[PDB]
Structure formats: C-alpha cells, structure tokens
Amino acid sequence: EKTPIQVWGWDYLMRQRALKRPIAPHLTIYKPQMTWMVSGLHRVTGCAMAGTLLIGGVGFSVLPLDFTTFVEFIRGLGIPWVILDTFKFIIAFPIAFHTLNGIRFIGFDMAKGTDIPSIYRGAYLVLGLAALISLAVVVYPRWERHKKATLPT
Amino acid sequence: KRIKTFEIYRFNPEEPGAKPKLQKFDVDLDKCGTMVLDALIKIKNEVDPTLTFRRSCREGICGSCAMNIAGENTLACICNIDQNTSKTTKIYPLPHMFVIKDLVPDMNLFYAQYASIQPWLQKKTKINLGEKQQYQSIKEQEKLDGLYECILCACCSASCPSYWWNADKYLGPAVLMQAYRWIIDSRDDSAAERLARMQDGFSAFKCHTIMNCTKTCPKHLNPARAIGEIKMLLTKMKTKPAPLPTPANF
Amino acid sequence: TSAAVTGAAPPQFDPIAAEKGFKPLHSHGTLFKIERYFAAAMVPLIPAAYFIHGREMDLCLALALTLHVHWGVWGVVNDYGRPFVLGDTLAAAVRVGAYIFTACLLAGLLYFNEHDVGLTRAFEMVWEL
Amino acid sequence: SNIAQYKVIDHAYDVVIIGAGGAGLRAAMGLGEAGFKTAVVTKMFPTRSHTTAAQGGINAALGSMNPDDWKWHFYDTVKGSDWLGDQNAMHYLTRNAVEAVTELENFGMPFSRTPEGKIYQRSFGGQSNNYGKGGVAKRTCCVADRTGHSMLHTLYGNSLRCHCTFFIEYFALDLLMDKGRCVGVIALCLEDGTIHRFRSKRTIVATGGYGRAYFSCTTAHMNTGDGTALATRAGIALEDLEFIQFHPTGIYGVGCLITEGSRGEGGFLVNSEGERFMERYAPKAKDLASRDVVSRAETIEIMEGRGVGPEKDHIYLQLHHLPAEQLHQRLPGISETAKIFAGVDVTKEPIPVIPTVHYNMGGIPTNYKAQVIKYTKEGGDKIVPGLYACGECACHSVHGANRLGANSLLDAVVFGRACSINIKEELKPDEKIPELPEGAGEESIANLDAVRYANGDVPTAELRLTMQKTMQKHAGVFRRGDILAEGVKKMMDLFKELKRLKTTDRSLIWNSDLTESLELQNLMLNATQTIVAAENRKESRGAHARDDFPKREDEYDYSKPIEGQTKRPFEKHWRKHTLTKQDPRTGHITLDYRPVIDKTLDPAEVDWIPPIIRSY
Ligand SMILES: Cc1cc2nc3c(=O)[nH]c(=O)nc-3n(C[C@H](O)[C@H](O)[C@H](O)COP(=O)(O)OP(=O)(O)OC[C@H]3O[C@@H](n4cnc5c(N)ncnc54)[C@H](O)[C@@H]3O)c2cc1C
Ligand code: HEM
Ligand SMILES: CC(C)Oc1cccc(NC(=O)c2ccccc2I)c1
Numbered sequence A: 001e002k003t004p005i006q007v008w009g010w011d012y013l014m015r016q017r018a019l020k021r022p023i024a025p026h027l028t029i030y031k032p033q034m035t036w037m038v039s040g041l042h043r044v045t046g047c048a049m050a051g052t053l054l055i056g057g058v059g060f061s062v063l064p065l066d067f068t069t070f071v072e073f074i075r076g077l078g079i080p081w082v083i084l085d086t087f088k089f090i091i092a093f094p095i096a097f098h099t100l101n102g103i104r105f106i107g108f109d110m111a112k113g114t115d116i117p118s119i120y121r122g123a124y125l126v127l128g129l130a131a132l133i134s135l136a137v138v139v140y141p142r143w144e145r146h147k148k149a150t151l152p153t
Numbered sequence B: 001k002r003i004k005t006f007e008i009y010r011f012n013p014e015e016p017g018a019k020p021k022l023q024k025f026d027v028d029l030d031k032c033g034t035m036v037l038d039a040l041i042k043i044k045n046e047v048d049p050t051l052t053f054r055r056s057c058r059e060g061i062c063g064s065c066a067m068n069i070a071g072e073n074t075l076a077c078i079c080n081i082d083q084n085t086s087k088t089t090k091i092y093p094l095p096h097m098f099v100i101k102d103l104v105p106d107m108n109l110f111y112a113q114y115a116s117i118q119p120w121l122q123k124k125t126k127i128n129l130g131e132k133q134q135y136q137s138i139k140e141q142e143k144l145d146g147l148y149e150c151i152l153c154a155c156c157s158a159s160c161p162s163y164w165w166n167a168d169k170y171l172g173p174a175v176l177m178q179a180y181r182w183i184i185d186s187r188d189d190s191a192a193e194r195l196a197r198m199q200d201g202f203s204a205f206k207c208h209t210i211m212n213c214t215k216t217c218p219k220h221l222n223p224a225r226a227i228g229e230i231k232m233l234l235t236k237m238k239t240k241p242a243p244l245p246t247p248a249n250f
Numbered sequence C: 001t002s003a004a005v006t007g008a009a010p011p012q013f014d015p016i017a018a019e020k021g022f023k024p025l026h027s028h029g030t031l032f033k034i035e036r037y038f039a040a041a042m043v044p045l046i047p048a049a050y051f052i053h054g055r056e057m058d059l060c061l062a063l064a065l066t067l068h069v070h071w072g073v074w075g076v077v078n079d080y081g082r083p084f085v086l087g088d089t090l091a092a093a094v095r096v097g098a099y100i101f102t103a104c105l106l107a108g109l110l111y112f113n114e115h116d117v118g119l120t121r122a123f124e125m126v127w128e129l
Numbered sequence D: 001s002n003i004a005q006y007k008v009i010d011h012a013y014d015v016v017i018i019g020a021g022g023a024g025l026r027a028a029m030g031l032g033e034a035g036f037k038t039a040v041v042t043k044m045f046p047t048r049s050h051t052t053a054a055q056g057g058i059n060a061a062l063g064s065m066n067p068d069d070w071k072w073h074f075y076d077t078v079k080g081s082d083w084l085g086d087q088n089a090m091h092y093l094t095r096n097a098v099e100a101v102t103e104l105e106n107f108g109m110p111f112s113r114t115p116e117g118k119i120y121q122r123s124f125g126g127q128s129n130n131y132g133k134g135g136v137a138k139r140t141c142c143v144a145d146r147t148g149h150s151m152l153h154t155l156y157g158n159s160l161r162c163h164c165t166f167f168i169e170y171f172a173l174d175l176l177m178d179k180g181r182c183v184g185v186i187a188l189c190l191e192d193g194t195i196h197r198f199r200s201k202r203t204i205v206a207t208g209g210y211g212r213a214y215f216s217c218t219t220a221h222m223n224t225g226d227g228t229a230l231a232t233r234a235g236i237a238l239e240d241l242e243f244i245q246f247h248p249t250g251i252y253g254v255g256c257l258i259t260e261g262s263r264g265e266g267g268f269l270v271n272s273e274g275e276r277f278m279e280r281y282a283p284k285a286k287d288l289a290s291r292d293v294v295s296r297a298e299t300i301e302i303m304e305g306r307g308v309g310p311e312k313d314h315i316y317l318q319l320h321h322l323p324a325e326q327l328h329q330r331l332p333g334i335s336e337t338a339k340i341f342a343g344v345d346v347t348k349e350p351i352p353v354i355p356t357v358h359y360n361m362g363g364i365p366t367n368y369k370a371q372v373i374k375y376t377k378e379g380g381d382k383i384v385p386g387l388y389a390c391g392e393c394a395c396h397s398v399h400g401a402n403r404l405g406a407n408s409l410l411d412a413v414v415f416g417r418a419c420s421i422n423i424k425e426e427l428k429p430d431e432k433i434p435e436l437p438e439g440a441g442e443e444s445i446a447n448l449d450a451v452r453y454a455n456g457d458v459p460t461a462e463l464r465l466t467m468q469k470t471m472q473k474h475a476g477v478f479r480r481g482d483i484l485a486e487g488v489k490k491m492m493d494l495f496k497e498l499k500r501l502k503t504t505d506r507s508l509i510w511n512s513d514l515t516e517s518l519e520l521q522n523l524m525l526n527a528t529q530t531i532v533a534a535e536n537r538k539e540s541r542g543a544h545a546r547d548d549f550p551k552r553e554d555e556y557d558y559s560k561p562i563e564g565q566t567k568r569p570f571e572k573h574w575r576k577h578t579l580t581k582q583d584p585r586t587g588h589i590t591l592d593y594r595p596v597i598d599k600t601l602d603p604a605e606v607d608w609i610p611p612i613i614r615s616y
C-alpha cells in the first residue's frame, strides 16, 4: 500500500509516458565525483561478494567438483607469485573497503560526518585503510614464506 | 577573439519523429558576461532564438535556471563560464526528468511532492491569526538556518540516483530537507504527524547516502545531513526537543 | 477562433484532501534500525574470522552473511525492480526472487560447510597458493 | 487568428488572480479561506516571482527594539511620498502593518529574533520616531538578508492549504472586457500551446513591475509590465508612471541589488576622497536618507569627479569596518552575492555600487480598496467593475513619488489581503459567473499569431535593447525637457519599428521567442507612457528630478509660511497624479491629471499630514 502522493506520482509517471517525452540524460552525462563513485563501489563490492558466495556455495554443491580439487587445478598452472597475491588482494579489498565504508555510511545515516570535507576525508581514509589492510594481508604471509625459504634453518 | 564552444542539449516536441540532440554554439567570451546564463541568452538573442530555457532573478535566488553544466547540477546564473576555450562546456537539463523542450523539464512531480509535506505552520491550539507573535528563541530559530535558504531549484533531487530510479515513491533530498524544516520548527506542533507521512520504506528511507545532493547544491546547503536527521527521528534514536517555554512577560 | 471546449482543472496534489481517510501506519523505522545494528555487530566479526577459524566460525559467517545479504539484495531489488520499467508482474517476480536468492545462498553455504572444507578453510587454501 | 489553429479552453472561476508573488498569493489565501473558487494565473512557478529576490525586510511598528507607533510610520511614509501619496491608502497601509506582519510570522515565516524571542527589526531608509523629530527608527522586520525569499516561500507554502487552484506558466495576454466590466483573463499555456479563457466575477491584477524597460535594473527578466499592458489594452489609463525608483546600491557591473539593510546595519557610501559624502547631502539621516536623495547624491559625486574605480563612474558601499559576526548574522546573502559578482570579500573590501532602476511606484490606478479606477475631469473616480490590482503593478497610491524601503512587501501583503477582504464584503453568491461575450479574446489571439509568425527586418532582441538603451539615457536620475523630448521622439519611433518585428521560433509549445516578444510589446507601452509623462512634469518631486525645473511645484509655496498666500489652481501646480492613456495600436498617448487624496480614512484615528519641505 502507498501514500496518497505515491499514488499521484505513479499517475504522473503515466502521463509522462503517454506524452512520449524523453528522459534527460543522467549517468552518461553526470560528472564523476567521490560521493557516488564510492557508493557505486560499496554496492558493487557488496553485491560481487554475495554473488561469489552464491555461485560458490551452490556451484560446488551442484557440481561433481569440490574445493580441494579446484585449488590443485589452478596451482597446476603454476601462475607467477605476483599475479596470485594480486588475485588475493582483489579478494581482500571488497571485504575490507565494504566493511570500512559500511561503518562510514552508518554515520551518514545518523547525520554524522555529512559535510563535504567530512565526505571527502571519509572517502579517502576508507579507500586507504581498505587498501593498506588488503596489501598487508596479502604480502605479510608471502613475506614470511620468503623468510622460511631462505633463513637460518 | 576568444571563442568558447557550448554543447547544448536540444529537443523539439513539436516536430514529428523528433529525438534529442547536442548542438555546438560558439561564443566570443569578450562579447559576453562572466556567467553561463549570459552565454545562453547571447546565443538565444544573437544566434538562435529557438533555444529555450528558464530564468528570472539574475542573482541565484529564484532557482528557475537550474540545469546540468560541466557534468554537475548548478544554477546557470552563478556558474562562471569556463574560460579555457579548448574545452567544450556541456549543458543538459536536470538529469532524469521528463523534458518539454530543450533545457526545460516537467517540474510538476517535484512540486506535488513539496505540497505533500504540508509546507505551512500547524498548531494544535487554534490561534487568532493576526493577534500576537509566536515565541521562538534565537537558538531555536537558528535550527532553521541552512534549511530555509532552499530555493526549490531541484539541482540536488536531480543528482540523486535513488530519486532517478524512484522519483515516484522516494521524495528526494529537496522535499525531505523541507519536510525537516517544518519538523524542527519549535513553533510547529505536528512533528509526529509529519513523520507518520513518510514512515514507509521508500518515502524517506530510500536515501542510500550517496551524497550527490549536499555536494551539488548551488546554495551550499546540506540535505544528506537533514535526511540523516530524519532517519534518527523516524527510528526513535532521537526526538524533537519541546519548545522552550514562552516567558511570562511576552 | 474562440469556439472552444470547457476545460478541466490541471492535475494537482491536494495535501489536505489526500489526508482525509488515509491513516495508515507501517513504520519501517524499527526495521531499518536493526538492519544497521546488525551491520555494526558484524564489524567485530569480520576480523574475528581473520584470526579465529573453525567449523563454528564458518557457521556464524554463514548465518550473519545470509541475513545481512538478505536485506542487502532486497534493497538492490526494490531499487531496480521498478514497475514503471518492468510492469508489475515481472517486477513482483524480482521481489520474490530476492528471497529465492537468500534461501539458495544459505543452502549453498550450509552445504559448503558440511560437505566441503568450510569458509575459513577455503580462504586458507587460496592464501597458501 | 489568420494563419493557424488554436485550442481554446474555457474555465469558470469566482476570482482569477494574475500573479503569484507577494500580493497575488496573500490575496489567494484570503479568498480560498473565505470559500471562493480561486484561480491563480502566473507565467512562472510562484516561487520564481520577484518577491523571492527581496532582502532588507518589511516594515511594521512591532516595537521589538524600541517603543514605536504606526502613526510615526504613517508620517515617514507620507513624507516619503513627497506628498504625491494618497493619504487614505497610506493610512490603510500603516494602520494594518503590525497585524499583517504578525500574520506572516503566525504562518510560519521564520523571522530572525531578539534575545526576548520577538521579531528582529533593523533600521532602514527614510524612517524616524516621533513624526520626524525623534531618531532613526527600527521598524524593518527582516529574516536576515533574504526577507523576500522567506516571505514568498511561506505564503506559497500556506497557499497550498487554501485549495486555490494553480495555472503555472500561463502567459496572460489580455483582460476579458465586456462593456467597461472585466469578466476574466485570456492566457497561453506554455506546456501545450493551448489558449485559455478564464470567466470570473473578479479579476485581481498582481503582475509586478517593469524594471526591464531599462538597460540596467535589479528586477528580474520577468519584470515586463504585463499587468499594466493589460490595463492599457483594456482602455485603462495608468497613473504616476514617470516615478521610477533608482535604488542607490546595485552592483556596478551587473545590477544585482545590495540591500539598504547593509546601511541601516552601519554601512556607508564612500567617494574617491575617502569622504563619507552622505553627511553633506543629508546631515540628519546621513546614509539612511531616502532612496531618491541618496541616488541623486551619488549621481552628482560621479558627475563632479569623485567617482570611484577605473573609470570613476560608480561609488563604494563600505561594510568591512563592521564585525564579521554581524555581517554574517545580518547580511549573509549580500556577503555571498558580492563575492560571486564583484569579487569582493565584504569584511575586507568595499562593494562597487551605483544607483539602479528598482521599483515602479507608478501603475494601475485604484482607490483605498484596491479597485481599479478610470478618471474623468467632471465625473471623477469611476470604478472599473470586476477588476482589482495590487503590488508593484498598482498605484494606490501608497508610494506617490518615492517608495520607502521595506514598504512594498507590506503594500503587497496588506492590499493583497485587502482584495480578499474587500471582495468577501462586496460579492454575494446570487450573482453568477459572467458569461463571455462572443469573440472574447479573438484579437488577443490575433496578436499571438501575428507575433508568432512575425516576418520583418528587426529582430525582437535588438528592439528591446534600443528601448532599454534609449530609456537609460533619456529618462534617468536627472532629466531635462530637451533630452526628454528627444527621448520621446526616439521612443515613438521604436514603437513604429514594432511593425517590422522578426520572430523565428514558430512553435506553440514553450516558445520563449514568442512570449519575450509579447513581453516586448508590453514593455513598449510602459516605457512610452513612462517617458511622455516624465517629459511633461515640469517640476522636481521624489524620484522624478528635472534639472531645468528643480523646485517642487505645489498649490502653495510650502517654504514660506502659509497664512497670507493664494492657492494656485490645479492647472498651474503639479501636486497631482499623472494619467497616461495610450491607443495600443497607434501608440498615441494623451495625458490627464487627477487630484491627490489628502484626507486620511478617519480623522478621529489620525490627522492628515500637510505638505512641508522634504529635508532628510
Ligand atoms: C532586488 C529587489 C529587492 C527588494 N527588496 C525589498 C525589500 O527588502 N523590502 C521590500 O518591501 N520590498 C523590496 N522590493 C520590492 C518588492 O520586493 C516588490 O515590489 C514585491 O516583491 C512585488 O510583489 P508583487 O506580488 O506585486 O509582484 P512580483 O513579486 O514581481 O510577482 C509578479 C508576479 O506576476 C506574474 N506575472 C507577470 N506577468 C504575467 C503574465 N503576463 N501572466 C501571468 N502572470 C504574470 C509573475 O509570474 C509573478 O508571479 C525589492 C525589489 C527588488 C527588485
Ligand atoms: C563487516 C561489516 C559490514 C558492514 C558494517 C556492512 C554494512 C552495510 C550497509 C550499511 C549496507 C547498506 C548500504 C546502502 O543502503 O546503500 C550494506 C549493504 C550491503 N552489504 Fe554490507 N556490510 C558489511 C559486510 C558485508 C559483507 C561481508 C557482505 C558479503 C556479501 C555484504 C554484502 C552487502 C550487500 C549485498 C549489500 C547490498 C545493498 C547496497 O549496496 O545498497 N556486506 N552493508
Ligand atoms: C552515474 C552516477 C552519477 O549515478 C549512478 C548510476 C547508476 C547507479 C548508481 N548508484 C546506485 O543506483 C546506487 C548505488 C548505491 C546505493 C544505492 C543506489 I540507487 C549511481
């Protein structure tokens, strides 16, 4: 059920249709800004992750394949160590950035940090911390795996 | 001569089979005012009288000339022309609004929604309309600053991707800040009933904190902050303070 | 010439006339609040699962992420499952599909934690590569 | 109607208001409250109306800063008019100020406040306590910098409760007359090119002023004097048109108004010497002297080489000496406007400003009840049945020869309300909506088509400009009989160039080429009538200043004592209203003159104010 204005609004949309009037261009023409790019990102990450959990969970169930014989198949390719840790970085970032920016947006929901300096500081800080955490979590063990390979015993 | 070139969205509903266009217009910057409106006028008067746009106030207060310049929603009359002539400056109408002709969008859903909030003082005790002044303290009235300035230009509502996709159900940042301008008016009683009118999951809550509104507002106001405030109010995280009591001698 | 036909009033929202007979109460308020409280609670959990692993974290990740992503996609769906662009039946089919997406998600994860390595372990095994 | 088809669409309303600014809306509210089927026709969304651009405030003796009396306001208002003001109407204006402005606040207009919680009041131009004997009055109620913005948005807001039905972006073509009586309006709907005929028992004309008659003005692009054009085309003579207010402080390059509030908060005008020159031209009120006196002060200083800037052709308005806490609390909008347009940090540099066309005290003649009037020499004030006018488009006359600062927003609200009040108490529901005479508005349509497909050599924008340019040069702040005569000579030629009009846009849907051409016609009527009136008034009074007639010619010489003089006859003195009667097609104007009303509405309430010397 709808408010009265939302009823009105739909009836408005119907006239606008029936008058064969065009809709003023929008995404095609609007300037890229940290405001919306980052919202776009927050949803894009949020969604990608869910989609991976679905294609993942359900995929490996509906296939004869399992997760172990998958990790051998890719290893088999013996792809370079930098590429792999980059694919790792790609996995960390959605989790990091969305988690961070998730709290950011909850501020915005509560009227907090809503001026433009706060909006841009917030943005950068959250892109930073997420990338840092993503670069740390990839490199740190890979760094300890090089310490293992070449150290004193 | 310094020749700036403009790319100006066109549409003629009169003509059969007509589809939107982009038209280049060259303007001698030395024979033209500092502001983007000035160019549109020059072009209308000296080059193409069929070029059609809205304007009144030449000073940024009516909000009639709201349009999309250089990618962002602004007022044409206080947007400086981009002096660097190797750029072409693009001028579309307010994004995602039905158009009538050229830079003039059907603005009526916007308006209807602003009616819906009931933008007028309500009092639960009938007053003698002319008789005396309602008390309101300075602090109390200063809550209205950054709220009553809104010129109804729609720049921000038309920068909100949620209001793009659901203009029909989500009210949008312009109408919502104004809904809030009457909620926190200490002189207004009906805060509760005002909030009741936008309880549902679309009216107010489809604000997904994208922030393009507070960004683009050519009056340097903040709707995203006001909406946030409504969310706190709408979830009982906060309440409207009661009016400071009207002192005995008043 | 002025031989003409009676006109009608232009469409226009009467905010008072609309007010007569509509009272309805459905506060999405208390629902919105918890969606956020729940995301706030997940902030601890995400790093908690970086460190502490096991079949029991696999379970809580699987439960929190199922419930959070439920409300997630629902929104995304109401944001783009618009009847103006899809017409109602097809758009109510996207609404319903937001729930099928929740239930398949869980089903898939449960399976994956029960007849496969588990979430935390699966993450280990790609990080080892 | 020759060369096209037109969808006409008929409506029946109790009262139809042309206008949706201050006056228009306040009228609508009262009417819709009192029950009437009210229709509001406006060529722009009502918030875009020029009222929204107002700034400094609205006068009322609220006494929120110091004790006050509406009689003192009355006084200051009449002294303001330089005794061209009708004192009955100036009485109604001021008596009802306190109540009118209180209502605004009671409607939710968010006035700035005093510590006590009351409406904040600032000082302004041409006002004083104790009938001119006291100090600089504080009567000017303000919402900061943007009083007009807040007032109009409030009225509009409250106009959504009154069930008044809006027709937004309809361009009003003509009044529908049926033998000296007005039965409605005819307009062009911009959204679809349909033509509309509104039948109505009343018609209120509230169309604002005609600032765009000139090259440089503070007014909006939409101030084209349509309402006055309408009346002129209904065979109604317009009154006092030669009285054109030049606001002392519009921004030099662009005409953007900088508020008188900025002086009455402590700002002053400064010349090239660094002198605060207004202390010479008006010792008692200094930079808060009346608008006509200040503008003339500047205009001389420019003439006598104390101009400022590169070319020495404007003066400075200085504010930087005031606290920034006060500059942001009281003048935030003009703080910003000066940044945007003049590059000026107002707390550190002065603003480049110069007198600028602002208000039009002249307009459609009316009585104290705002009922439009025609005037015979021997029959007198004969009311036009069905028609009312208020706001800038009217000449009540509450301003006479000089409008006071913050008195117009008042006149709009007060006499707007007065229209609703006076109509409730004169229109009874036995009387039905007037049936239109046949062929109603057929000519108005003929003009539309003609302008619409106009062929000729001279485009519509070129003509407007030379109208505006002519007018700026020949009917300025200081005038002479030869310059004026040469200016009439040129204006009447431009009227003839109208027949050679080019238009280009042929559409019906949202055609700004067309409506601006309709506006240009309307502006020619006002400008031609304005200048012939101005050319003939061989005196100096209020805004109208003749170099070659620098005295104010009244019935007596009010600079000698009065006892033992002999009253000059009507014909030899100038204390009268100028009336201008123009054949719209030929363009020929004939003058007439109409006595100034000196009685107040009730002598037991307030005593009429005899003329004296106007010394600020
Ligand atoms: C920059 C500026 C600042 C000012 N500041 C102050 C101040 O601080 N205090 C003060 O007292 N006064 C001030 N004034 C004077 C005052 O604001 C105006 O005189 C007042 O706003 C006029 O109100 P109005 O309703 O008569 O007309 P406006 O407010 O001019 O509105 C005119 C209306 O008539 C309509 N209209 C016109 N032509 C047509 C047509 N052909 N068809 C249909 N509709 C039509 C328009 O659409 C519009 O809605 C200021 C004026 C200016 C220019
Ligand atoms: C760890 C802390 C997290 C927090 C605080 C958080 C918070 C939020 C918030 C506030 C939203 C609403 C955004 C909006 O309305 O625009 C949201 C949306 C979403 N989240 Fe999360 N989230 C977290 C982790 C995750 C994870 C791990 C996933 C994994 C699949 C996920 C998937 C989503 C999805 C799909 C949405 C969709 C709604 C949208 O983008 O508009 N989130 N999240
Ligand atoms: C092009 C930019 C300015 O605009 C766009 C275009 C497409 C999608 C979106 N962004 C959303 O649709 C979106 C993102 C996050 C949360 C809610 C939403 I409704 C923005």
Ligand code: SF4
Binding pocket: B063, B149, B150, B151, B152, B153, B154, B155, B156, B157, B173, B174, B177, B216, B217, B218, B219, B220, B221, B223
């Ligand atoms: S908020 Fe800023 S942008 Fe949105 S309407 Fe009011 S002014 Fe125009």
Ligand code: F3S
Binding pocket: B156, B159, B160, B161, B162, B163, B172, B173, B206, B207, B208, B209, B210, B211, B212, B213, B214, B223, B224, B227
């Ligand atoms: S752009 Fe739109 S979604 Fe929210 S904060 Fe701003 S309104």
Ligand code: FES
Binding pocket: B037, B054, B055, B056, B057, B058, B059, B060, B061, B062, B063, B064, B065, B066, B075, B076, B077, B078
């Ligand atoms: S024309 Fe008034 S806002 Fe630009």
